[PDB]
Short mmCIF file of C-alpha atoms and ligand atoms in Angstrom, two decimals:
data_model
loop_
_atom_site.label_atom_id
_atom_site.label_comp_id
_atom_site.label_asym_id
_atom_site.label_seq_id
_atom_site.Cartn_x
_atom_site.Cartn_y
_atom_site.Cartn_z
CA UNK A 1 0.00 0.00 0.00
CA UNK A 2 2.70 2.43 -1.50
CA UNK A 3 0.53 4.73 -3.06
CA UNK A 4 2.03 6.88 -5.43
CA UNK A 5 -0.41 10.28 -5.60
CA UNK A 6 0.27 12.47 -9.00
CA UNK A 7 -1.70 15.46 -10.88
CA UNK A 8 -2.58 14.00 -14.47
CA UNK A 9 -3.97 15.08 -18.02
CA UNK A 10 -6.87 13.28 -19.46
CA UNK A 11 -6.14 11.20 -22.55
CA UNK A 12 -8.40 12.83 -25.01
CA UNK A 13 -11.00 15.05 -23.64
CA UNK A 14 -9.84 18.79 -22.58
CA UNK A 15 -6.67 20.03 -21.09
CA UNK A 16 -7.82 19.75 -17.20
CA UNK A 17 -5.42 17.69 -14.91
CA UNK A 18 -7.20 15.62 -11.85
CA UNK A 19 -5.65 13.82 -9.06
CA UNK A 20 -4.94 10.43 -9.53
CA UNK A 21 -3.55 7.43 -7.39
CA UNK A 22 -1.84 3.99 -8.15
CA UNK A 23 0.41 1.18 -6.78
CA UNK A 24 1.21 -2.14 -7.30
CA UNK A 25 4.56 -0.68 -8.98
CA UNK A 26 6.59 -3.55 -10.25
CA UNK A 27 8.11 -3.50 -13.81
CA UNK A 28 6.80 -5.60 -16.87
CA UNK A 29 9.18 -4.56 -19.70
CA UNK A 30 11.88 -2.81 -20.70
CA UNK A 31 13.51 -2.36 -24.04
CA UNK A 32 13.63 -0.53 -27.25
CA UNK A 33 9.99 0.50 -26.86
CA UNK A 34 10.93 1.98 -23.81
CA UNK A 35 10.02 1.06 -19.72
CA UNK A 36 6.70 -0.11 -18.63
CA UNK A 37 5.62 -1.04 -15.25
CA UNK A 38 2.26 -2.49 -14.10
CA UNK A 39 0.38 -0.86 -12.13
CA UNK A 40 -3.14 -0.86 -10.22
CA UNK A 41 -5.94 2.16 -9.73
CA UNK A 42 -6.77 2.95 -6.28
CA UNK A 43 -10.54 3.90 -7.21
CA UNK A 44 -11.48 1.18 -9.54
CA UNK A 45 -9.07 -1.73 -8.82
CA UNK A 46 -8.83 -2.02 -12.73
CA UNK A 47 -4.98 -2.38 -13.89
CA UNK A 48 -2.66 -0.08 -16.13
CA UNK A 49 0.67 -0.06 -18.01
CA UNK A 50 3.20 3.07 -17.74
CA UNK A 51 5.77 3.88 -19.86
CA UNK A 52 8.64 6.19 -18.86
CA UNK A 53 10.99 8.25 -21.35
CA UNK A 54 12.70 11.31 -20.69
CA UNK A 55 11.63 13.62 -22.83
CA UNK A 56 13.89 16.72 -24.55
CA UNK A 57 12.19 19.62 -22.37
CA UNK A 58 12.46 21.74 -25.47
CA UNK A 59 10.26 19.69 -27.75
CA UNK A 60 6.96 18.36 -27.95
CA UNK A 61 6.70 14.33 -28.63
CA UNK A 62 5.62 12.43 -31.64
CA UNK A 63 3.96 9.70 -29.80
CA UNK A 64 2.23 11.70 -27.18
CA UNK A 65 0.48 13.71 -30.02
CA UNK A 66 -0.80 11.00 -31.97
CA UNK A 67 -2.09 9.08 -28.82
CA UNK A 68 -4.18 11.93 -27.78
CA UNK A 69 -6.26 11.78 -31.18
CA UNK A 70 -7.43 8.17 -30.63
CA UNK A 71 -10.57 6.58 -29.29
CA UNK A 72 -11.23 3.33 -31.07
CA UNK A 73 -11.89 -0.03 -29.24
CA UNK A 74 -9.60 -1.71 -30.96
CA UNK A 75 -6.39 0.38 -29.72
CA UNK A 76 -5.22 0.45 -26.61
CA UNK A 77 -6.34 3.65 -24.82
CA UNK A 78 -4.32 6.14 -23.60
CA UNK A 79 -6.64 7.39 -20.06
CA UNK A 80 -3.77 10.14 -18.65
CA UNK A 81 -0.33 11.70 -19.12
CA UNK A 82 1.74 13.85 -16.72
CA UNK A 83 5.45 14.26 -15.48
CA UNK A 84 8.22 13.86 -13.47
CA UNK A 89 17.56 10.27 -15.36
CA UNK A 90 17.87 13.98 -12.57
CA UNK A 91 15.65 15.58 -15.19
CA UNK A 92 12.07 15.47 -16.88
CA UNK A 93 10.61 12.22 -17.62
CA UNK A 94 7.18 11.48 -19.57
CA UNK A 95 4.58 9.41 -18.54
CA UNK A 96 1.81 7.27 -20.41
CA UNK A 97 -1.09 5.57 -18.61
CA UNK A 98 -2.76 3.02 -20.54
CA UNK A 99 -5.37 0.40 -20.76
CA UNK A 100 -3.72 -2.90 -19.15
CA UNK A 101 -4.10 -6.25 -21.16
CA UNK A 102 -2.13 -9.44 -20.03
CA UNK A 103 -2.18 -12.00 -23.53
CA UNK A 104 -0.68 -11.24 -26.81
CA UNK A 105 -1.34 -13.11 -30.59
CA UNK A 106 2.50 -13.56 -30.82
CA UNK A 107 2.29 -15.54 -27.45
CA UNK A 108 -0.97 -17.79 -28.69
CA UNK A 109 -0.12 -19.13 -31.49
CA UNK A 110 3.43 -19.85 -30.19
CA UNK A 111 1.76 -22.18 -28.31
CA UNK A 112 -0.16 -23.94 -30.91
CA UNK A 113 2.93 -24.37 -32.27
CA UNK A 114 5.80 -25.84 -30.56
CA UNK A 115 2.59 -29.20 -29.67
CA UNK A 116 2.55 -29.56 -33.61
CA UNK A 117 -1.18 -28.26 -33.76
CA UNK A 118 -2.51 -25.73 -35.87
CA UNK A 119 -4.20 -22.14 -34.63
CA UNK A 120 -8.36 -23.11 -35.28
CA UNK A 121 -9.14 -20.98 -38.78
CA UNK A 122 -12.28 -19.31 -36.66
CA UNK A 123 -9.63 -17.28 -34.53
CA UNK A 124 -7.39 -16.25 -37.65
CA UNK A 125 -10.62 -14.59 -38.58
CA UNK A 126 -11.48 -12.55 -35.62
CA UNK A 127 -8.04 -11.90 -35.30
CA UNK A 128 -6.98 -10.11 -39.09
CA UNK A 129 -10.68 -8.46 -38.87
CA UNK A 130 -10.03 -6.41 -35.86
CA UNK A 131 -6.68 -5.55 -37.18
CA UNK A 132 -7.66 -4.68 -40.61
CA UNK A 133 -10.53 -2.30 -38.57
CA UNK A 134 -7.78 -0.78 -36.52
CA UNK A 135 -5.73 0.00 -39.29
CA UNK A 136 -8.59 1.76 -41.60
CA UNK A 137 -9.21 4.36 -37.91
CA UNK A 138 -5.32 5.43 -38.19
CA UNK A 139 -5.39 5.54 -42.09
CA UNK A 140 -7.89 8.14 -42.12
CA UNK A 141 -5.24 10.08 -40.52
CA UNK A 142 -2.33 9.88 -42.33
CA UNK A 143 -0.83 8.18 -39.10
CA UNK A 144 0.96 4.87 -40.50
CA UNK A 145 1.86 2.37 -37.51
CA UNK A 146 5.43 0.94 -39.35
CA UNK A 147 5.58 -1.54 -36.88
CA UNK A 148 2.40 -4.16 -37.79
CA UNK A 149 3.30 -7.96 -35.95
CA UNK A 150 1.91 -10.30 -33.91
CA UNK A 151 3.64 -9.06 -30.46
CA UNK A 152 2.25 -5.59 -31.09
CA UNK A 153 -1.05 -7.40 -31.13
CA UNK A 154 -2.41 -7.73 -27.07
CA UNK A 155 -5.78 -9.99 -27.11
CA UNK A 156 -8.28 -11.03 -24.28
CA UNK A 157 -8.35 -14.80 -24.29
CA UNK A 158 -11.89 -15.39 -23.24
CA UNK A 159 -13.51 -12.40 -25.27
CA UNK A 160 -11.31 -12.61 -27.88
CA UNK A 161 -11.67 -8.55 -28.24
CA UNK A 162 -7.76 -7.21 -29.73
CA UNK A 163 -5.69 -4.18 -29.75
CA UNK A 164 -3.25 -3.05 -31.52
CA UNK A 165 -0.42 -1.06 -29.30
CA UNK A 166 3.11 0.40 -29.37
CA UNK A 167 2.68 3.69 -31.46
CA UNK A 168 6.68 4.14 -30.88
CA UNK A 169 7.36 3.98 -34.66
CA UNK A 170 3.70 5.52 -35.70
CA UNK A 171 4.18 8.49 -38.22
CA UNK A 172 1.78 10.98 -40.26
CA UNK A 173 2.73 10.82 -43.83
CA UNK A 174 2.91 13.69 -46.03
CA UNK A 175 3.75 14.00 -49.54
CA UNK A 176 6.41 15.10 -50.88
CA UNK A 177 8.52 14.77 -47.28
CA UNK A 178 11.12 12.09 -46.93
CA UNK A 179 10.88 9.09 -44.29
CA UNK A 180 13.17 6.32 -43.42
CA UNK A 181 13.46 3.27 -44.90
CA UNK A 182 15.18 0.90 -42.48
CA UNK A 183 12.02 0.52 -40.91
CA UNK A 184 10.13 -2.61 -39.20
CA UNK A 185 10.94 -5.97 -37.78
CA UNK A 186 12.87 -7.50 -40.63
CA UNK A 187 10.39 -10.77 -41.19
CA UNK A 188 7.81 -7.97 -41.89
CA UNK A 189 9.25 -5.42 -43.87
CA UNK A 190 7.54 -4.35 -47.09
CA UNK A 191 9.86 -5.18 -50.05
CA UNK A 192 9.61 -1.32 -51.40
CA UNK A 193 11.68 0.05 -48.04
CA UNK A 194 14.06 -2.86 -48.27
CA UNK A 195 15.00 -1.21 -51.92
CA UNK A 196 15.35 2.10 -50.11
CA UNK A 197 12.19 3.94 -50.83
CA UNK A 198 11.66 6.92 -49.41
CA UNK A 199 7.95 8.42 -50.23
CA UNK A 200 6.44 4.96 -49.26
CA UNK A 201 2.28 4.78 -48.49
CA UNK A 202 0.27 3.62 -45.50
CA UNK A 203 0.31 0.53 -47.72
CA UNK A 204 3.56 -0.94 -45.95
CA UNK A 205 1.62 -1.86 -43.06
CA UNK A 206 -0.88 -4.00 -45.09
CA UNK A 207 1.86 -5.72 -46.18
CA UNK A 208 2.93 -6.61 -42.97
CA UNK A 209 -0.47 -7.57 -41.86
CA UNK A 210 -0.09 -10.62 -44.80
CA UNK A 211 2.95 -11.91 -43.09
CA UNK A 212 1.19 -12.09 -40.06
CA UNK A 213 -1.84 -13.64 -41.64
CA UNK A 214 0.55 -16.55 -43.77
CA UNK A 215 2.20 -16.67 -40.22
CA UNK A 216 -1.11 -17.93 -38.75
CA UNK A 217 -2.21 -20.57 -41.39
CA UNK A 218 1.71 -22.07 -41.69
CA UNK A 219 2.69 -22.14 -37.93
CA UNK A 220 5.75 -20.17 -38.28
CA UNK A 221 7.05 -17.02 -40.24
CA UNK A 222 6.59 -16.83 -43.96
CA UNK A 223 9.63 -14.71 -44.99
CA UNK A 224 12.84 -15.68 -42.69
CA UNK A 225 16.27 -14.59 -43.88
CA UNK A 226 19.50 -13.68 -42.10
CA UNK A 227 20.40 -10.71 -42.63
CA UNK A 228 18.50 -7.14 -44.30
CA UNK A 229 20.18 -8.51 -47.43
CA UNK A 230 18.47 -12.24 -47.36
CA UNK A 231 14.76 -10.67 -46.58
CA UNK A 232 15.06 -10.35 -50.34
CA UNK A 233 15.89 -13.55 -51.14
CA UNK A 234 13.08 -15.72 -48.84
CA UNK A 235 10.47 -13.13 -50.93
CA UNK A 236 11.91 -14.10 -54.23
CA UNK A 237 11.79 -17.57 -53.61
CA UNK A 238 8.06 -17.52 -53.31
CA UNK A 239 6.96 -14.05 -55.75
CA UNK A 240 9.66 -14.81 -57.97
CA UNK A 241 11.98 -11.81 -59.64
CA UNK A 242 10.62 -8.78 -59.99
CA UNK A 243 10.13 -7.12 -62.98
CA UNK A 244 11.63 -3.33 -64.29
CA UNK A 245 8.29 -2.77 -64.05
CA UNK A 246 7.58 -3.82 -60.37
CA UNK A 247 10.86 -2.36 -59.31
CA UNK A 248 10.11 0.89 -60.78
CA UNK A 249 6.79 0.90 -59.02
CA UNK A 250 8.54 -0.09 -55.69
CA UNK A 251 11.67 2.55 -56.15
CA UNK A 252 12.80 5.05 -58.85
CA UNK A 253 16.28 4.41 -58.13
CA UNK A 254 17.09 0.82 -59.72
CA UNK A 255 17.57 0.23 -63.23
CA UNK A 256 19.91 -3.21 -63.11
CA UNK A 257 18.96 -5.93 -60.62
CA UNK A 258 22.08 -7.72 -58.56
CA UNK A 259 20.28 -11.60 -57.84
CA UNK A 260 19.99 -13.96 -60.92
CA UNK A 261 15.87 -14.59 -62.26
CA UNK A 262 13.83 -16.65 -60.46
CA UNK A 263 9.72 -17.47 -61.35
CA UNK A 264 7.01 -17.53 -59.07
CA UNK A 265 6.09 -20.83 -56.54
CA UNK A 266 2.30 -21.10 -56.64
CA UNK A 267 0.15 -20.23 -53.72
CA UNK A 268 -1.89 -23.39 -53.32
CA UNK A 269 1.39 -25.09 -52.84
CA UNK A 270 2.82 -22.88 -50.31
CA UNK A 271 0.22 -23.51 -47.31
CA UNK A 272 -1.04 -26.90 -45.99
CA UNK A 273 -3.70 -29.29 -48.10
CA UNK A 274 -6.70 -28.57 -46.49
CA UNK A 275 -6.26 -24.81 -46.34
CA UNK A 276 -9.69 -22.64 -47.35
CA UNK A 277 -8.65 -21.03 -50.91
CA UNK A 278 -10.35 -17.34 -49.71
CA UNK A 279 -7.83 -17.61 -46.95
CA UNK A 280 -5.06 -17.94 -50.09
CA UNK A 281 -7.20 -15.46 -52.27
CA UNK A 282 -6.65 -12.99 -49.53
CA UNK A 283 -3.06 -13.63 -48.61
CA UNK A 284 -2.45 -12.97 -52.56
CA UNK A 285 -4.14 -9.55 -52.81
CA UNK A 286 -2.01 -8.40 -49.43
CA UNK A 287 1.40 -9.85 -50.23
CA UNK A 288 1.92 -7.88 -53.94
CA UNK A 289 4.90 -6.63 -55.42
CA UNK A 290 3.10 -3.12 -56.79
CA UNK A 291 1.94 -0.46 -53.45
CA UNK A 292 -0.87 0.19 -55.32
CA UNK A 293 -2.29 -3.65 -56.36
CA UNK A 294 -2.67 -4.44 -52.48
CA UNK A 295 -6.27 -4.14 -50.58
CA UNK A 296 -7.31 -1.01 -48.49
CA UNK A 297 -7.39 -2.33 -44.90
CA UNK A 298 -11.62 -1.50 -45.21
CA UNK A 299 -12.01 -3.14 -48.71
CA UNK A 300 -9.84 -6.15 -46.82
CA UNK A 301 -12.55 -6.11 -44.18
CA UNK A 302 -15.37 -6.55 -46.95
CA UNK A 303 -13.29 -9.88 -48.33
CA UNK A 304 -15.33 -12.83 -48.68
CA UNK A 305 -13.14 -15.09 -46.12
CA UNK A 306 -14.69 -13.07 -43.33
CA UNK A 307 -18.24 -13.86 -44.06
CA UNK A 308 -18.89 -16.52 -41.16
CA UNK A 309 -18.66 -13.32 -38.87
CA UNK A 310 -21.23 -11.87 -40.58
CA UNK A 311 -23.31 -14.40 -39.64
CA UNK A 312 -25.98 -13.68 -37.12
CA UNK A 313 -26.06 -17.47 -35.48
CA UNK A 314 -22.27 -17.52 -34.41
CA UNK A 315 -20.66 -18.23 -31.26
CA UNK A 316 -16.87 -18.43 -30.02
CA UNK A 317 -15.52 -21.71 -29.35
CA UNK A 318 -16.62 -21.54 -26.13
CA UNK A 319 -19.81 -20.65 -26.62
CA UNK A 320 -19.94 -16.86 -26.16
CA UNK A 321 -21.25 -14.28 -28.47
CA UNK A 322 -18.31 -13.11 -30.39
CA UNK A 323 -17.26 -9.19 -29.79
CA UNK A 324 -18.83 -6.25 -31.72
CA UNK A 325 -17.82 -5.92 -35.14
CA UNK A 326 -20.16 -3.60 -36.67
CA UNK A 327 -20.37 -0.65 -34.86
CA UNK A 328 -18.65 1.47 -37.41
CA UNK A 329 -18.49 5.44 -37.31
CA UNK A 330 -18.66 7.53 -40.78
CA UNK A 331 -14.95 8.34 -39.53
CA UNK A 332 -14.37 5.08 -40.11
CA UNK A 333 -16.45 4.58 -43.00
CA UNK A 334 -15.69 8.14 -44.84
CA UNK A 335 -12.54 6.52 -47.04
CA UNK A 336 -15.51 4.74 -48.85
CA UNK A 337 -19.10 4.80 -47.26
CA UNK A 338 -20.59 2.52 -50.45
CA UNK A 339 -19.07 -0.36 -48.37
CA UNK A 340 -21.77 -0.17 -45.22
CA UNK A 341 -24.06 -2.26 -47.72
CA UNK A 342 -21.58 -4.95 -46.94
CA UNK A 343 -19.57 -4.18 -43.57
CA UNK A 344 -22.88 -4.02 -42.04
CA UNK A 345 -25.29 -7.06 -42.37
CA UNK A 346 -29.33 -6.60 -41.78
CA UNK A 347 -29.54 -7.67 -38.43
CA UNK A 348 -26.65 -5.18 -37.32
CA UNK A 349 -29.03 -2.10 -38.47
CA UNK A 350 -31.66 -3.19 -36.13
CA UNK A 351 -33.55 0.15 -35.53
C1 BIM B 401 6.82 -10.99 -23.66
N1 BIM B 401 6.79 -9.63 -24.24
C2 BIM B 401 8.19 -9.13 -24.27
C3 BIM B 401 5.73 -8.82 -24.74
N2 BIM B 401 6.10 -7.84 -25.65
C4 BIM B 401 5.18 -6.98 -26.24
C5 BIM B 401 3.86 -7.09 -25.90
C6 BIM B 401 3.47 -8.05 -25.01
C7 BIM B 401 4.36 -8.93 -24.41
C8 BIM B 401 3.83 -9.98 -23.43
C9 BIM B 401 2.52 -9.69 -22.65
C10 BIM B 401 2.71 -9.31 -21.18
C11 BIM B 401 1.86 -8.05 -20.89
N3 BIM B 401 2.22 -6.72 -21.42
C12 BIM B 401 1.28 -5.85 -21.85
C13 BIM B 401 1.87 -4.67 -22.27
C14 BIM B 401 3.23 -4.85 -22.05
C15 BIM B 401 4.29 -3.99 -22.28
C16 BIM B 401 5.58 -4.41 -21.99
C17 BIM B 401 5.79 -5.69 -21.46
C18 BIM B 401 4.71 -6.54 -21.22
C19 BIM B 401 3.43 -6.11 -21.53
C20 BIM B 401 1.21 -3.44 -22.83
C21 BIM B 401 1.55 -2.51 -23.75
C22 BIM B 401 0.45 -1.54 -23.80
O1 BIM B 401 0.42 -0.57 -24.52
N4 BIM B 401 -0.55 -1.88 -22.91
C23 BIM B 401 -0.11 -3.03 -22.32
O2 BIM B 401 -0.74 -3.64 -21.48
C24 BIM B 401 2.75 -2.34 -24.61
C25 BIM B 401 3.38 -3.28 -25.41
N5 BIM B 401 4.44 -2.70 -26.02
C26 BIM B 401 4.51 -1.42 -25.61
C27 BIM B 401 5.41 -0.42 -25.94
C28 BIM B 401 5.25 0.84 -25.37
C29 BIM B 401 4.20 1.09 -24.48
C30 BIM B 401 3.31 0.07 -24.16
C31 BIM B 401 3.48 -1.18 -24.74
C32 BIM B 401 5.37 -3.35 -26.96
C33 BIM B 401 6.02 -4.65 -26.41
C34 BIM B 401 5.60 -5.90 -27.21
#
């Protein structure tokens, strides 16, 4: 009962500091993302995380900033900030949640079982969803995997977390390209490309997805330089063409021609071919050939959640998945027809 008592900033209503109160202090994590402790409310009992920088006093701070224009259920929610190695540090208080995808289908794994197909739907769904919020931003995550993807076990509800890397895009101004847990990374930034889209993290989500049908990552590779060369194996060489589309800036290629290994005989036998059809439309040489996370959503491999008389595995109703805003929607409204089903417009 070492309560720690501090004056804090609400997350994204108006600038008006409360008093707020916590212990429970022990540390969780602490890393390149930064230092997080766990931590537990006074008032409610409920349970937070708290990570800790110290911040350049002279300068505001990029993930701060894009936090505090974010409500969607589907991303963790930032409740308060406030301050406090002598000098300055910045606080985060966020929504607490204890399971990650990463860590669940690890387990499937290593017993030689594969991850039931009803969960890879729930899963990409909710992620697609959280992406299409952000997009309508210009705010692209560059850091899409399955440990930056926390889940509730028993409600199966996700969020998406880590906004570390997160960036508003802007044309015409540069960005790095090194960029992204290598198994992940979009083939365009691994040629250098530096006026990449919010496109890079659909790619990534298709790694993840091929991750969850094969038991273990799609794209390997040793080194930045090999990335390449796990890719090519599968998409084959890409053309002048492609490579134009991908960068400006290469003219002669430097790895001898290989053609394309077909889909069906990448993944397992029994695999469901809208599952592939998908996976195809994601993982595409050419930025502009791959899905919009919200025309993704629409795909016709998520249609069992669309189903009215559908139940998790054990035997709950499954989470809300149709409660979209115009927000959400406003990229291209012509899809509610589709994202939401008859019985979801119940007036
Ligand atoms: C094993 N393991 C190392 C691991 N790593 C990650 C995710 C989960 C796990 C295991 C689950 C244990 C519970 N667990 C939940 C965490 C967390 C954070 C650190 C350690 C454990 C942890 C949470 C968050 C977050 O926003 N709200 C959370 O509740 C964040 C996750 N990250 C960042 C970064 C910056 C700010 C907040 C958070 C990125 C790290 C990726």
């Amino acid at each position: 009962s070492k309560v720690t008592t501090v004056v804090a900033t609400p997350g994204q209503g108006p600038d008006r500091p409360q008093e707020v109160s916590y212990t429970d202090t022990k540390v969780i994590g602490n890393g390149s993302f930064g230092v997080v402790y766990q931590a537990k409310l006074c008032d409610s009992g409920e349970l937070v995380a708290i990570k800790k920088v110290l911040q350049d006093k002279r300068f505001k701070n990029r993930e701060l900033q894009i936090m505090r224009k974010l409500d969607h259920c589907n991303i963790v929610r930032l409740r308060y900030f406030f301050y406090s190695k002598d000098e300055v540090y910045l606080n985060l208080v966020l929504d607490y949640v204890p399971e990650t995808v990463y860590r669940v289908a690890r387990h499937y794994s290593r017993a030689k079982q594969t991850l039931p197909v009803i969960y890879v739907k729930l899963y990409m769904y909710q992620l697609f969803r959280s992406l299409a919020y952000i997009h309508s931003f210009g705010i692209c995550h560059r850091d899409i995997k399955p440990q930056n993807l926390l889940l509730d076990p028993d409600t199966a509800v996700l969020k998406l977390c880590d906004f570390g890397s997160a960036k508003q895009l802007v044309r015409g101004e540069p960005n790095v390209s090194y960029i992204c847990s290598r198994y992940y990374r979009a083939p365009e930034l691994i040629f250098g490309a530096t006026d990449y889209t919010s496109s890079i993290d659909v790619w990534s989500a298709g790694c993840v997805l091929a991750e969850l049908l094969l038991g273990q990552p799609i794209f390997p590779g040793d080194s930045g330089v090999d990335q390449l060369v796990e890719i090519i194996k599968v998409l084959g060489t890409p053309t002048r063409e492609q490579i134009r589309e991908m960068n400006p800036n290469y003219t002669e290629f430097k790895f001898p021609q290989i053609k394309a290994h077909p889909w069906t005989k990448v993944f397992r036998p029994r695999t469901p071919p809208e599952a592939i059809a998908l996976c195809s439309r994601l993982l595409e040489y050419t930025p502009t050939a791959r899905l919009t996370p919200l025309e993704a959503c629409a795909h016709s491999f998520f249609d069992e959640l669309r189903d009215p008389n559908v139940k998790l595995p054990n035997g709950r109703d499954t989470p809300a998945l149709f409660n979209f805003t115009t927000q959400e929607l406003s990229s291209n409204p012509p899809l509610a027809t589709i994202l939401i089903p008859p019985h979801a417009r119940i007036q």
